[PDB]
């Protein structure tokens, strides 16, 4: 039982797109497909549904066009176009299929999701910096370390260590956006024999700008 | 009166293999009738489809020949009728049901070739008419004339294979053996006595029949439908007031059968003229129809499938519903061969229908599909004119195959069945056998 | 339509502890739904019609309520239960979903792990210059940060940005960057950055020096 | 003549009394069975708890397994004969009975020993169904709210009795049309006329089936899928099937009958020597229900895993010889419970057997063994009880394969026909008999 | 409804190849599936069938696993694969969809065949040449034009004209077989008030090599 | 495993003819089906259990037989007729086909029309020169093609094909391929094609010449 939602991404103000949602695991048609957004770090909101037969669509309270739901059980596939969009619509769209119980439906078993971003900023790809303890500081029971991931659009970049091998005690903040560019840091607490007597790397893709960057992380010579 | 009942019990279910042997050839004859007469029926109203094609250019002289045919078809059929089996018109199964209560005389030498050749005729040229009516009638004389030809004696050989010619008749009509068996049981048999007919004949009747049937016809349901969505529980509400909307519908309908009866005498009095005449009329009136508007003509088995689907407007359907109101009374209240039977089952579908189109918009929190409604509205006609709620249901299930809707399509029937009740109606094949067996005894 | 407000906001509760979140409703409702969204992860169906357990939901949790008001409860709170849940009803249409409410594994509390960071020698290679700042692993959430250059306090180009809870410790950590044109940076030496945490009236401080 | 144009323009209609008090009887059977149904789930997730905390030392499980199957088996034993006499076995016959107005529906004493009597014999695992229990039950439950308000006539008296008992086999396999058909083939006074309202016991049954729906929603009891069809040259072979039913049909009555007898003699009508005998079968029920489940049990879990042909033949064989003894020893004793259910249970398994044969047999008719599972399932019914048509009916209301109509009917049919030629009576009847007959002698 | 049956073409004696049948326009489960083969010039032989759930599968009078039949209902695909292949392997095979009508069995509908061709020869893309009518053209009525399709290797090819648009009056020759390379040539006839006057284009395509080529018949400069 | 057997292997008939085919059968077998396979094309379910037609069969074909003879009749055959016809039962494990007969067509006379092709000039790049000549549309289907370069018999490296009987016309058509190389076919001027039929005593000629 996979759903499995794309065509996300980045659009211009007042464009369009088609997101899709791809479904295995089940027979398609008999079940209601649905679409569900998530403006970000907020409230979920329903936008339609639409029924096996597709002879019915239904929207929410939302204007003529701007929403087109439609699906194709030959390909297994679920549709939504958004036209003319605007800064409302950047968030994370999951679907999701419905059932119910006593027959108020509830949303069975949902996708993981495709943001979509509306911005006329463009893509830009990130610099990397590494974050050494200065020759100001004295080594104690652990090190810290860090890089900053600054001046990028848009989300996401991914940010491991060591190719992902040191996964304990890292910290990658939230991206924040600023004058049309997103900057993030990332933390990851060694302990104070672990380095500069080994290698601490960090990896970072913002693949959205095909970038692909690893930043070792030299103490401050 | 215990150690009757003792010896009753050690005594039960044992049926004379002689009873058993002839209902099974009373099943295989009623299913090669009813295939012949299905075949006939078809080949006519092909007939009938090549003629317009021959004249599909001169609009008036088309819709002259649709006119004529269906005119000369039905005449031919109102006239066998009347000339040699009166008793043979109309439906046949309350005459049956008469029968089975030994009020009615079965002469089958008359009616097997009036109401086959009748019905042919009737059905033939595209009148509002079903199968049932010739084939459960035809079915049950079969079932006198091989208890005749075989002179087989006693209460239980008269009754049995009576009943098992009924049911195989009702059964080969819409290929559904359960319907037949619980049709006997149900509506057919003596409704206030106990009677002898064995069970157990009257399948192996329905059987044969259905085998026959089936040889045939292989290959092709009569209404296909698709497997349609589910009913939640909160959604079984809604299938109460359609049922009620039945109950009270059911006699209103009854009434007009009835009294259209009465009001389409006078047009001819009794008079074997004015009747054929007017015969041919209404017949006419059909085939004309069954071109200008053909969901308002035909047996109705056509539009099911296409109502179901919901690929009428709301509009549209009205309009089928009172076309067919009025075209179904004209065709059987007249008093011609066939039964009301199937063309109920049509009204219920449309009719479900459009109580279904209004549920959807109304509630969009249920994601109804109109269909479900069109599938438990399909027998709750039957449910409410005819009062045989049990075969209703069973029928539609057999022949629709949406068994996940069997809650909605008895608790439509049921409160069909209880507002059909109280507001007096009366099950409209009991109504007809009391009218002509009144009717028998106030000329006297 | 309907509008469904959940009560608690965020919440904070230690393991094996009795837990209810509302659900109040705008007007009258039937049969609500409760989803469970782990961080960064797909919703998942929890409780539904009132509250029927999805098969897979540990038995400790449990819906109830009617009309205008519902109610998720967890008798024995655990580790893997902190996460978000949005109560949604379809009685009417068109169906909504609450407000959400956080909730959150309560903990002894940390004072913060304090890192401070200069520019590095590439960014300068460009003419901008961040001074990060790691306030690492502490409870509560709630912490205040405070710049100060050559000993003076700044309010611009900081920002600030906190990670949710933690699943290995269920502490926040927050970052503090101040950017600077290389210049602007350059004409200064002592920089410092100062936390205050629930933890201590004498904040944190954790500075360097160009020189 | 004039009589019948009387009584035709009188057809078809109930005292809304009668409906009414239909509607609230269908209910109580409902929840009444819906509660049972849990409370049999409820003991033999119990004794599954149990065998988990001595999951270790082998023989000790095996001894738990015996113990609480046999302190349960006990119990019920015990309600049953200290209690009501006539609420052991099925109680089936004990309802036809009522309906002729041949036995006394004593409910006061019924309801309470027949539950928690079935309670002990099915939630320890026994060998028997549940329609035995909520039939009866649901009679009992129709006679208690005809007394209780006090209703009267020969209509109010019949009516009640048969929705409840409708309404009581309906919430037992969330059948209702096998409810209704049930009671007017089988239940109702088969030689005299009555005054059962049938619009009366529909809406019974509808009430209790809404009942049971309402807390047994999207879980069917036999899952099998959609089967694929059979062509009309396929057909015979039903028949063939229909008259191996027909022959062992009342082979089956003889064994079940004869070991009632059989089994009484071990005990000779003390209430020591039976209830302890009762615990002792009860105790090799959960023990086979681990050694061998198959063997064990209601049966309902061994239908689909039969149908889908995932049985061999030998573990077929087995477990037919097997299900055959353990059918017996729980009814045959006496025991508070149906044999409806292991009916079933039985038939598919000789019903696939067959198919399996058939398959290779005839590869060029390309067939499915589980369509065969399907005819036979509802078979033995149809030769042991004699009521085809709730038989068919059942079936197809429960494995919902509407296109195998025909071979289902002619196995069933084919099966009464033998059942009828080699001289076996409709074991519910027998069971009449016996008991009305041993009343007067 | 259609059956299109694919992964054949050339192959290794004693060698072994898959090839996949995709369905599309019936409930694929719910059909038992069969393939039948006919060697070049020969007859039909039956090769074996596998039923929807796949617990049955009988084949011919066959060997060991020389052939293996599968079906994916996931993918709506029924699948062939052939061991040890000797020449009686050379055929066209068709995947058949399995009915009955009172129960004797019967192929529904047939797919449209690959060729397979066991050989040790290779893979060639043919050459395809214009065959335009020599300079002094005394063009009657109707011009007869066509184009040669020689040094392929192996079967098919299919010639069309202007991409099925010219279907009346074209004949295509079988190939005739020459030092292991096969040859044909396709004719066509138009209007001569019709051509040079309009683009006529034929399409050849060898699917073993995944070739088109798309020739346009050019008059004598 | 019986063996179906069928009476014609090749049979010609002339539209409007009654014609018959035969299926005969090594036991007996029942419900017989028949195929058409018409010129590369797929079989096509024709007739079925002995005497049904599938939809779209034009009634002019029949079906019959029993036990080990069964056959197909044509009652007015059409020259849309022309194909292969393979019977098949499967009465019997394994199912079995027939060996196929091929229907053919009488039909008046049709004078080829012939097509000479000079070598392409991109062929001339390759090495060869492969000249070419049509014989188009002709009936009955023996022809004589006839090769003459610069007056001269040429019968070394021709290669010839028929195509089947046309499903509409009932004619054939004919392709020859003689086959030089580049200078074999440069050291010549005058090419000729010789068609000899039927329709003509005195063979129908075709020539380039490349001056």
């Not at chain 2, 053996?177 to 509506?187: D, W």
């Not at chain 2, 026959?212 to 349609?228: S, T």
């Not at chain 3, 782990?38 to 539904?48: D, F, H, L």
């Not at chain 3, 655990?78 to 609450?98: L, N, R, V």
Request: charged share 15%; net charge positive.
């Amino acid at each position: 039982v996979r759903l499995l939602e794309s065509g996300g991404g980045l659009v211009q103000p007042g464009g369009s797109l088609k997101l899709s949602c791809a479904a295995s695991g089940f027979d398609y048609s008999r079940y209601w497909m649905s679409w569900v957004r998530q403006a970000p770090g907020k409230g979920l909101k329903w936008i339609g549904e639409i029924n096996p037969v597709s002879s019915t669509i239904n929207y929410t309270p939302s204007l003529k066009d701007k929403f087109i739901i439609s699906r194709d059980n030959a390909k297994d596939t679920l549709y939504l176009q958004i036209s003319k969009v605007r800064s409302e619509d950047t968030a994370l769209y999951y679907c999701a299929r419905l059932y119910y119980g006593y027959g108020y439906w509830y949303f069975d078993v949902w996708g993981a999701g495709t943001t979509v971003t509306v911005s006329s900023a463009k893509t830009t790809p990130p610099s990397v910096y590494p974050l050494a303890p200065g020759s100001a500081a004295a080594a104690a029971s652990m090190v810290t370390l860090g890089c900053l991931v600054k001046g990028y659009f848009p989300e996401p970049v991914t940010v491991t260590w060591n190719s992902g091998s040191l996964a304990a005690g890292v910290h990658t903040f939230p991206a924040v956006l600023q004058a049309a560019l997103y900057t993030l840091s990332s933390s990851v607490t060694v302990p104070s024999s672990s380095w500069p007597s080994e290698t601490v790397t960090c990896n970072v893709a913002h693949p959205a700008s095909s970038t692909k960057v690893d930043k070792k992380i030299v103490p401050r010579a | 009166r215990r150690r009757q009942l003792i010896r009753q019990l050690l005594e039960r279910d044992k049926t004379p293999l002689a009873i058993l042997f002839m209902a099974a050839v009373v099943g295989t004859l009623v299913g090669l009738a009813a295939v012949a007469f299905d075949k006939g029926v078809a080949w006519l109203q092909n007939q009938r489809m090549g003629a317009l094609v021959h004249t599909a250019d001169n609009y008036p002289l088309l819709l002259t020949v649709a006119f004529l045919c269906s005119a000369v078809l039905a005449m031919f059929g109102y006239f066998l009728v009347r000339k040699y089996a009166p008793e043979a018109g109309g439906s046949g199964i309350p005459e049956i049901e008469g029968a089975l209560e030994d009020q009615r005389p079965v002469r089958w030498w008359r009616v097997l070739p009036v109401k086959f050749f009748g019905g042919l005729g009737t059905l033939g040229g595209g009148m509002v008419l079903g199968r049932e009516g010739p084939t459960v009638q035809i079915g049950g004389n079969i079932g006198r004339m091989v208890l005749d030809i075989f002179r087989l004696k006693g209460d239980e050989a008269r009754h049995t294979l009576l009943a098992t010619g009924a049911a195989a008749g009702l059964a080969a009509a819409f290929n559904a053996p359960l319907a037949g068996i619980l049709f006997i049981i149900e509506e057919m048999r003596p409704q206030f006595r106990y009677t002898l007919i064995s069970i157990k004949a009257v399948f192996i009747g329905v059987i044969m029949s259905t085998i026959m049937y089936r040889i045939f016809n292989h290959e092709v349901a009569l209404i296909d439908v698709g497997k349609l969505s589910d009913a939640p529980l909160n959604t079984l509400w809604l299938y109460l007031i359609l049922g009620i909307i039945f109950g009270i519908f059911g006699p209103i309908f009854n009434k007009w059968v009835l009294g259209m009866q009465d009001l389409l005498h006078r047009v001819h009095g009794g008079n074997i003229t004015k009747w054929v005449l007017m015969g041919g009329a209404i017949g006419g009136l059909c085939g004309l129809l069954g071109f200008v508007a053909p969901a308002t003509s035909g047996g109705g088995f056509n539009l099911i499938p296409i109502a179901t689907a919901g690929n009428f407007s709301m509009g549209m359907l009205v309009f089928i519903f009172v076309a067919r109101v009025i075209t179904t009374l004209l065709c059987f209240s007249s008093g011609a061969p066939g039964g009301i039977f199937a063309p109920m089952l049509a009204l219920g579908t449309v009719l479900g229908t459009a109580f279904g189109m209004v549920a959807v918009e109304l509630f969009p929190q249920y994601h109804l599909e109109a269909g479900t409604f069109a599938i438990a509205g399909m027998g709750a006609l039957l449910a409410a004119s005819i009062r045989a709620p049990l075969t209703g249901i069973i029928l539609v299930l057999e022949m629709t195959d949406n068994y996940q809707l069997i809650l909605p399509m008895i608790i439509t029937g049921l409160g069909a069945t209880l507002l059909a009740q109280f507001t007096g109606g009366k099950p409209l094949y009991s109504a007809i056998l009391a009218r002509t067996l009144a009717k028998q005894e106030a000329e006297q | 339509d309907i509008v469904l407000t959940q009560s608690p906001a965020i919440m904070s509760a230690a393991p094996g502890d009795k837990v209810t979140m509302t659900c109040s409703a705008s007007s009258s409702v039937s049969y609500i739904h409760w989803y469970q969204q782990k961080s960064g992860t797909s919703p998942k169906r929890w409780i539904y019609d009132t509250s029927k357990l999805t098969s897979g939901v540990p038995v400790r949790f449990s819906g109830s309520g009617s009309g205008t008001s519902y109610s998720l409860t967890i008798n024995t709170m655990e580790a893997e239960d902190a996460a978000t849940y949005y109560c949604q009803q379809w009685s009417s249409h068109p169906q909504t979903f609450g407000g959400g409410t956080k909730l959150e594994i309560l903990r002894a509390d940390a004072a913060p792990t304090v890192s401070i960071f200069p520019p590095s020698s590439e960014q300068l290679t460009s003419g901008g210059a961040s001074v990060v700042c790691f306030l690492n692993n502490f409870y509560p959430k709630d912490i205040n940060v405070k710049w100060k250059i050559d000993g003076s306090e700044r309010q611009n180009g900081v920002l600030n940005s906190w990670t949710d809870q933690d699943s290995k410790d269920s502490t926040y950590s927050m970052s503090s960057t101040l950017t600077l044109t290389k210049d602007e940076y350059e004409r200064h030496n002592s920089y410092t950055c100062e936390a205050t945490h629930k933890t201590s009236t004498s904040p944190i401080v954790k500075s360097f020096n160009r020189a």
